[PDB]
Amino acid sequence: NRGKAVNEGNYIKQRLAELRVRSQRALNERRQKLATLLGREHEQYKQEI
Amino acid sequence: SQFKAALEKFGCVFDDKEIHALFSKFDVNRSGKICYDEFCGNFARLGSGNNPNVNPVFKLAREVPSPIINKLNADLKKQGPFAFRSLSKACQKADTFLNGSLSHDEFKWVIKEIGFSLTKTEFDNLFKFFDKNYEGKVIYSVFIDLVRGQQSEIITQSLSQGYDALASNNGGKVTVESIVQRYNPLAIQIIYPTRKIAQDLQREFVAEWGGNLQQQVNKNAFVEFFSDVRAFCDSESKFHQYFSNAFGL
Amino acid sequence: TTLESYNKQLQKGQGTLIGNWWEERELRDVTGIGRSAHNSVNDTNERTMGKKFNHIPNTTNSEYGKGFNKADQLPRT
Amino acid sequence: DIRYIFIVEWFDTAASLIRTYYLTYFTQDKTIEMYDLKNKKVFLKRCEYAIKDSDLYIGSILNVYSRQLKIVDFADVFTRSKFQNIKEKTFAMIKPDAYIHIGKIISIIERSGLQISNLKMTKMSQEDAREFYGEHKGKPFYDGLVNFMSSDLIVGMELVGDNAIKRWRELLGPTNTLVAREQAPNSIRGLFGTDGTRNACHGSDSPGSAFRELNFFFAKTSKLKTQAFFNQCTCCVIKPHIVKQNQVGEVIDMILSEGFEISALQTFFLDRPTAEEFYEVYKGVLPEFNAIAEHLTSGMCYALEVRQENAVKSFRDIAGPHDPEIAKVIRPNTIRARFGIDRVKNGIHCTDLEDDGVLEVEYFFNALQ
Amino acid sequence: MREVISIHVGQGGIQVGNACWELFCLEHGIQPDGQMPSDGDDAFNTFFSETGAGKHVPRAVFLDLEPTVIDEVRTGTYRQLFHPEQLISGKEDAANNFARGHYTIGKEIVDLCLDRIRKLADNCTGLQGFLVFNSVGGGTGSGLGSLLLERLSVDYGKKSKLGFTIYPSPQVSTAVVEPYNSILSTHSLLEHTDVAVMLDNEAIYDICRRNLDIERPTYTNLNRLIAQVISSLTASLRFDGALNVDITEFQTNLVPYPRIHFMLSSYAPIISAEKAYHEQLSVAEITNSAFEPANMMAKCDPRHGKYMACSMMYRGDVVPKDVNASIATIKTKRTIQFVDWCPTGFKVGINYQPPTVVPGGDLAKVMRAVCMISNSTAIAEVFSRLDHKFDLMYAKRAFVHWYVGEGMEEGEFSEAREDLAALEKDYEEVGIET
Amino acid sequence: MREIVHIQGGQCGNQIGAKFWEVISDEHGIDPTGTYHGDSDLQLERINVYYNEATGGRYVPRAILMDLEPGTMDSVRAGPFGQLFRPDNFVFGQTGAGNNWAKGHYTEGAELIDSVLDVVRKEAEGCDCLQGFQITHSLGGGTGSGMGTLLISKVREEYPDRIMETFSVVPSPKVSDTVVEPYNATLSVHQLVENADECMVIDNEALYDICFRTLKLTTPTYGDLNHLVSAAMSGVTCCLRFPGQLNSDLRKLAVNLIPFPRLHFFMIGFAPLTSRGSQQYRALTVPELTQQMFDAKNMMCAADPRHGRYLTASALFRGRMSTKEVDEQMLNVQNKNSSYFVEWIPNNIKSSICDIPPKGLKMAVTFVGNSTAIQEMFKRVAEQFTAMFRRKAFLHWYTGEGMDEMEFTEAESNMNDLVSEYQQYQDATA
Numbered sequence A: 001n002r003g004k005a006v007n008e009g010n011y012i013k014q015r016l017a018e019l020r021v022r023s024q025r026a027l028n029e030r031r032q033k034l035a036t037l038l039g040r041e042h043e044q045y046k047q048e049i
Numbered sequence B: 001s002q003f004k005a006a007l008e009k010f011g012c013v014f015d016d017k018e019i020h021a022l023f024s025k026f027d028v029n030r031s032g033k034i035c036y037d038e039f040c041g042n043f044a045r046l047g048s049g050n051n052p053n054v055n056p057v058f059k060l061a062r063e064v065p066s067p068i069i070n071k072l073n074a075d076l077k078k079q080g081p082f083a084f085r086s087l088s089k090a091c092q093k094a095d096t097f098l099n100g101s102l103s104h105d106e107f108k109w110v111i112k113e114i115g116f117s118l119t120k121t122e123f124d125n126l127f128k129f130f131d132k133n134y135e136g137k138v139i140y141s142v143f144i145d146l147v148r149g150q151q152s153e154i155i156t157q158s159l160s161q162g163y164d165a166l167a168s169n170n171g172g173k174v175t176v177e178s179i180v181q182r183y184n185p186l187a188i189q190i191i192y193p194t195r196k197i198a199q200d201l202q203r204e205f206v207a208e209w210g211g212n213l214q215q216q217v218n219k220n221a222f223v224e225f226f227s228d229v230r231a232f233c234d235s236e237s238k239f240h241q242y243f244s245n246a247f248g249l
Numbered sequence C: 001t002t003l004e005s006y007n008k009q010l011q012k013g014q015g016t017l018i019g020n021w022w023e024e025r026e027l028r029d030v031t032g033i034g035r036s037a038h039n040s041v042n043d044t045n046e047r048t049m050g051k052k053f054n055h056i057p058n059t060t061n062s063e064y065g066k067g068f069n070k071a072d073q074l075p076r077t
Numbered sequence D: 001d002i003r004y005i006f007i008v009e010w011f012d013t014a015a016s017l018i019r020t021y022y023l024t025y026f027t028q029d030k031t032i033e034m035y036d037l038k039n040k041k042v043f044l045k046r047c048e049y050a051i052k053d054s055d056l057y058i059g060s061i062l063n064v065y066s067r068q069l070k071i072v073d074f075a076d077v078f079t080r081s082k083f084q085n086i087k088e089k090t091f092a093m094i095k096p097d098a099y100i101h102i103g104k105i106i107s108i109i110e111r112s113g114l115q116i117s118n119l120k121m122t123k124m125s126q127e128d129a130r131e132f133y134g135e136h137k138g139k140p141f142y143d144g145l146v147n148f149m150s151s152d153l154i155v156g157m158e159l160v161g162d163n164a165i166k167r168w169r170e171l172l173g174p175t176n177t178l179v180a181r182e183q184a185p186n187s188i189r190g191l192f193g194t195d196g197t198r199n200a201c202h203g204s205d206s207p208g209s210a211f212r213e214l215n216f217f218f219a220k221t222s223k224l225k226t227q228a229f230f231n232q233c234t235c236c237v238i239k240p241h242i243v244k245q246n247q248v249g250e251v252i253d254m255i256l257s258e259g260f261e262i263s264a265l266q267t268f269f270l271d272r273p274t275a276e277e278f279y280e281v282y283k284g285v286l287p288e289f290n291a292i293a294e295h296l297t298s299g300m301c302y303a304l305e306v307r308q309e310n311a312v313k314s315f316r317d318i319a320g321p322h323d324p325e326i327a328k329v330i331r332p333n334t335i336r337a338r339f340g341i342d343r344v345k346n347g348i349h350c351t352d353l354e355d356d357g358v359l360e361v362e363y364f365f366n367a368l369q
Numbered sequence E: 001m002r003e004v005i006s007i008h009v010g011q012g013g014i015q016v017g018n019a020c021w022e023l024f025c026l027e028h029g030i031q032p033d034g035q036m037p038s039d040g041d042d043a044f045n046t047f048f049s050e051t052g053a054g055k056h057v058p059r060a061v062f063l064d065l066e067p068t069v070i071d072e073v074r075t076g077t078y079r080q081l082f083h084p085e086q087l088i089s090g091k092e093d094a095a096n097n098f099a100r101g102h103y104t105i106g107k108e109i110v111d112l113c114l115d116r117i118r119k120l121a122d123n124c125t126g127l128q129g130f131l132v133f134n135s136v137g138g139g140t141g142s143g144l145g146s147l148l149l150e151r152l153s154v155d156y157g158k159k160s161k162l163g164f165t166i167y168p169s170p171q172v173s174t175a176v177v178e179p180y181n182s183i184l185s186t187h188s189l190l191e192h193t194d195v196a197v198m199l200d201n202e203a204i205y206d207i208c209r210r211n212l213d214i215e216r217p218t219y220t221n222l223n224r225l226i227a228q229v230i231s232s233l234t235a236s237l238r239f240d241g242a243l244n245v246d247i248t249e250f251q252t253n254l255v256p257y258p259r260i261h262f263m264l265s266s267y268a269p270i271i272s273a274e275k276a277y278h279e280q281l282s283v284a285e286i287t288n289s290a291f292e293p294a295n296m297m298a299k300c301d302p303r304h305g306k307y308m309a310c311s312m313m314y315r316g317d318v319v320p321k322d323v324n325a326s327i328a329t330i331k332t333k334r335t336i337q338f339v340d341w342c343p344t345g346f347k348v349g350i351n352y353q354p355p356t357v358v359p360g361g362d363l364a365k366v367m368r369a370v371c372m373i374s375n376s377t378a379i380a381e382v383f384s385r386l387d388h389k390f391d392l393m394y395a396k397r398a399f400v401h402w403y404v405g406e407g408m409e410e411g412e413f414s415e416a417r418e419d420l421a422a423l424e425k426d427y428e429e430v431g432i433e434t
Numbered sequence F: 001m002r003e004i005v006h007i008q009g010g011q012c013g014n015q016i017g018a019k020f021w022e023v024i025s026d027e028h029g030i031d032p033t034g035t036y037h038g039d040s041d042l043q044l045e046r047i048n049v050y051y052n053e054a055t056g057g058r059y060v061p062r063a064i065l066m067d068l069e070p071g072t073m074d075s076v077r078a079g080p081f082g083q084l085f086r087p088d089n090f091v092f093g094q095t096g097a098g099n100n101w102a103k104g105h106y107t108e109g110a111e112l113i114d115s116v117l118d119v120v121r122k123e124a125e126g127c128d129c130l131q132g133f134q135i136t137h138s139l140g141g142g143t144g145s146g147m148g149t150l151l152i153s154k155v156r157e158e159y160p161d162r163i164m165e166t167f168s169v170v171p172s173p174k175v176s177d178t179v180v181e182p183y184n185a186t187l188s189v190h191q192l193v194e195n196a197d198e199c200m201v202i203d204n205e206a207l208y209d210i211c212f213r214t215l216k217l218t219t220p221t222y223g224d225l226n227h228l229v230s231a232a233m234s235g236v237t238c239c240l241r242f243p244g245q246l247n248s249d250l251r252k253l254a255v256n257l258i259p260f261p262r263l264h265f266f267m268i269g270f271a272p273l274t275s276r277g278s279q280q281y282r283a284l285t286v287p288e289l290t291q292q293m294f295d296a297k298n299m300m301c302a303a304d305p306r307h308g309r310y311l312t313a314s315a316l317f318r319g320r321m322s323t324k325e326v327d328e329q330m331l332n333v334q335n336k337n338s339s340y341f342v343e344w345i346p347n348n349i350k351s352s353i354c355d356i357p358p359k360g361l362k363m364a365v366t367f368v369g370n371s372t373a374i375q376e377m378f379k380r381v382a383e384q385f386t387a388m389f390r391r392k393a394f395l396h397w398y399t400g401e402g403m404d405e406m407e408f409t410e411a412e413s414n415m416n417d418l419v420s421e422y423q424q425y426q427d428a429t430a
């Protein structure tokens, strides 16, 4: 009888990472956009120096 | 909640309205925090029985702590006539916000700055008595009144007469300038002998007063000041004969 | 032992400087009656025990449960 | 000479438990000595650290030798008495007839020498406004004042300092502004007052009333919701070194003067997890996430919301280079050029991406409430 | 499903029960009122039982005849935790007399004790065994412990019993007639306790002086360290690990002969909060420190004897290959020597749960720990010294009247003496190589 | 629970007990009117040990007041704290003993002791569980040394199992106060040995020396000596009234301190005692306390401890301390002074710990010792007895009231016997 709770807990535990990876990739794409933005800004600054 | 749990412990379970009525019957101050000390005292007096010959003693209210404040007053006596005023000034200074009550740590601070290194156990008794229901704040006015003791009605009336006589020469207006300009510094010998010089006497008097000579003075503050002065002296006769010399009255 | 003798009744002051004058001095200062009240009574407690530091500690068999770590309450992540 | 000693506690992280030291302060020569209460060894001996006299107060936080310390209370009567004088609290109010003058008002208040303990701005709704100013009721001033009050956004601040309850009032000037010009032209009411009911600012008058307004406005139980929008807006942060060095008044008016509309600013104390967390977009980029995060949590900081037609890039134009050393050479009129010192503490920080301003402003004004 | 029963008798037993129970309550996060805030595996079943709704009640029983300690517990900080009527308190002290607590006054409390043991064991379903705590060098402790062991060994039978007893120190001792009680209690427990563990006092005094650098320790530090040892021993039943070892895997892997079941423990690391984070805390160094004679739990020099069996239990994130290499080095160094007929002598247990720390304690928060239990022939010297003291103070019938006047006959001393001599002879005989 | 009753007889007993009850009431926070005004709850957990509760909630001692003349009771009732004692607990005679042991032990002592026996019987049976009896008296007087010891015999007859303590103001020749000291001293110590479970001997001369030297008071008073005796006697039974780390009862003390049934005469000491002007100039630590308590001059007996070997000793520490320093100081004092301890019994020191020090004090030490040095008192007493008995001086006032010289011979023989086998162990070796 006790196995039902184990089944549930495993399901939630694995779904948690299954969605955590999507959250991480959502955060990570902004990383690249912002990096490119400041990269272009810095070279523009240097050339105008 | 703890009260109804305690009733359940003895086994008398009652509905919430009856529980509330019983709680309110003993929670007269309406604060909401009952004192089981008074609770059990009431029950013990009820259960002792009625005997005209023998009283049932016990207690229905928290007693004055006694020797902790007695020693406090006795050792406060030694510093000087204005040690009593020192405590008042310190209470006002610590109460920078002017509410009328102090926090627990602030009361500790005012005690140690007065200079009495009260231990935890000795402090706790006066603390618990003066804070009836553990609200978190203590009223310093009642504390200082109890520490000073009882002031005589005739003494207070004489102080009021002195205030009125002082106000008369200025037309009802008050200033510390007036008390500084008119008094008898040498009269302090009769409340207690002192070797200090009359020239300095004015300096200590103004120093214990405010630096500004235009500070506003209330009648209650003035009589409070001389009550602090009186509390150092143990004789009403000596105090009033000193006051008479001090104001030439 | 030829005590008392050349030091009779006197209150306050540094005394006469013979016998146990130093020891009677502090007794007389802390409490009235430096020596053997006339039959103002004398309490044996102060004479025998000494300075009283009133304090009652806890058993410390009841300190087992109570112990506090303020750090644990930080929000962490 | 004379010594000021305290009690301080530091939260270690390698060790879970927190420790406690004394931090004695030789004022004759401005040096610091560290000694711990338990186990009786001297911790840090006789080394100057150049700490200004003003910052020492109850609840203050000061960093030393890469560890941050938080003063809790004094340690003796002599230290307690001297600093006990500076604790008075007053409640100052900026009514919406001077919404354009916020920067100058704050600048003058700071120059007065008082300390801006806490700050907020809200919309004072009709019913709670009627509750406020309760004592007046009968007088004809009442209804006019109430109708004026709920007109627009309001700025409430708390001033802590010596002699404050009347120092603030005398700095403010007369109650009527019409008289203020002839008696005291150099006053807040003199400079920014129009008429009797449209006076610039408001101050406390009695300690009891001041406390009443204080727990009305700043206490945890308040009915004043933070009136602020969450669309077409940008977020910016006044870094703690700026408020420590006292240029917040200058900074605020500069951004107001640019036609941008300020929507909300509030004072916030946040810890190191919150600091690193808000900077979650700069973990893996060169602005040195660790140093900037640890500096961001070293004191109070203001969080401002700015509104404009095209908020993000337009505000970025005025913000200029992230490095003030860059900015001085080329963008001499930008705020970071004028106020920033170096890379780590480059004054203002604003978002640098088009579509993430809403989430960042939501983080401050919704999540941290 | 698996449970043990805790017996705590004597003042020493009660003052160690308080520490072990605060540690157990803190480890599972149970508040003093008994509630579980939580926020759920059944790891509390070993020591606690659910009341049906909310709180949990420990599976322990407390015995003593002087009411002082029991009343202090009932008014302490855990007043509402324990079961109120399982804290059995007597009327009069046995007062350092073996015969008093075993022949005159101890007989009117054993009936209640057995009734409560029956009531609690009927609630229990998968009982593993008994863990008993008692002070040997005292009247009520020794007498009531002996009587309880006598009764249980007949009533329940084959269920295992482990006793954590506190023998006298060689010189750091309190009582004066105490060796008599010690000899008689050893006689009683020899044929009734499945495992016995040494817990003398001055050795742990030296431990705390040397490691914590605490110059002002009291019984509380001693009891906290002992509770740490007990928790490290019993973790495996209630926590997940790579190699779990239950209580039945002690005597089947550590007892060569039925008479030889006296053992001595050790625990590591023991360090303060300041000296820990500047240290390495490696598995190799902690397991090397576990075998240091000065780190041992009892005042004996194991270098004067051989080793028969050792059971070591690690908790934390230890690695089995690291354990194996460390054990290889242990066998390599020549200072410690094993007996010929024991080629393999090491039991290894591993638990994932790191040790728990108590606020306001002395030990620091550490991420590896090892508790070792050793059976060795070096136990002979403590018994030899006890026998020497007994002979010296028995040559002239000292204090014999106090015992004979309570009902005990005179001849019992001779039987205990001869049985102890036989035990010493057995430990000597087992020491000869083939 | 395990409560004890108090019995006092004679002038010495009455004064000592009056001081003792003032001390106990002060310690437990009871006013002279018998109403509790204490501070902490710990003062009420074991309040029933020494006090009984009456209707209304006032506490009364379970003490018995006994003498052949009413003057001393009339004085103590008028003195401070005299209202606590129940008026029915007074039993007094109308004649007086005249410092004659036969008078106080055969004729009027016997016709009077029925009432006090009834009172002690009802008082003992009233309480739940007796733990024993304690007596304070003098062996040098008539009424005390006779009637008190006869009452000891009587109570021991019906209570063979319960423990009995005696606190005896034994005479010393330096401070001589009566010419008939040897007679009543020997007779009292005769009928004391077979009945008293513990005896604690006290010397007025030793108390005077202590007061003059340690406290250094110019002119002392019996109040001081009574207070010191009260402090020690109250410190004896602290484990029964307060929680601690190692509780030790009177039976524990008797078992740990009595090797043989006839060796139960004990000598006691108290620490710390300091002059009033030097109270703030000394530290409070376990080494200091042990150094002061072990000092031979500090003892409450005229016998010199360093003239014999300690058989057993016990100490009742109070306050805050640590077991390792306690037992380490005991081990150190046992090692550095192995000559003063008998070798064939190892570890002859008891230590017990109580968490409650006396009011106004941090730490306190009560020391009780069984040592061979006490034989000197009996030796000198027997010398005086035989020297004054060879001429039969003062004998006829005894012999004319049912006394025979044969029991005087018996007393001399018994004391010589006790001296013999009590000093035998001093030279006894293993």
Ligand SMILES: Nc1nc2c(ncn2[C@@H]2O[C@H](COP(=O)(O)OP(=O)(O)OP(=O)(O)O)[C@@H](O)[C@H]2O)c(=O)[nH]1
Residues within 6 Å of the ligand: E009, E010, E011, E012, E013, E015, E016, E093, E094, E095, E096, E097, E135, E136, E137, E138, E139, E140, E141, E142, E166, E174, E175, E201, E219, E220, E222, E223, F245, F246, F247
């Ligand atoms: N380590 C340690 N030992 C203790 C503690 N409490 C008691 N003991 C030991 O107990 C021994 C004496 O026994 P007691 O504690 O007095 O109690 P008992 O053994 O049940 O016998 P009784 O004294 O008659 O009650 C002492 O030698 C101590 O070593 C403690 O808290 N910690």
Ligand SMILES: Nc1nc2c(ncn2[C@@H]2O[C@H](COP(=O)(O)OP(=O)(O)O)[C@@H](O)[C@H]2O)c(=O)[nH]1
Residues within 6 Å of the ligand: F009, F010, F011, F012, F015, F016, F097, F099, F138, F140, F141, F142, F143, F144, F145, F169, F176, F177, F178, F204, F207, F222, F225, F226
């Ligand atoms: N220490 C001390 N000794 C006392 C006190 N009162 C009397 N004595 C001694 O007791 C002896 C006389 O005893 P006594 O009163 O005649 O005994 P009683 O006749 O049986 O009551 C004298 O040697 C005194 O030294 C006292 O208050 N304290």
Ligand SMILES: [Mg+2]
Residues within 6 Å of the ligand: E011, E066, E093, E094, E095, E140, F247
């Ligand atoms: Mg016991």
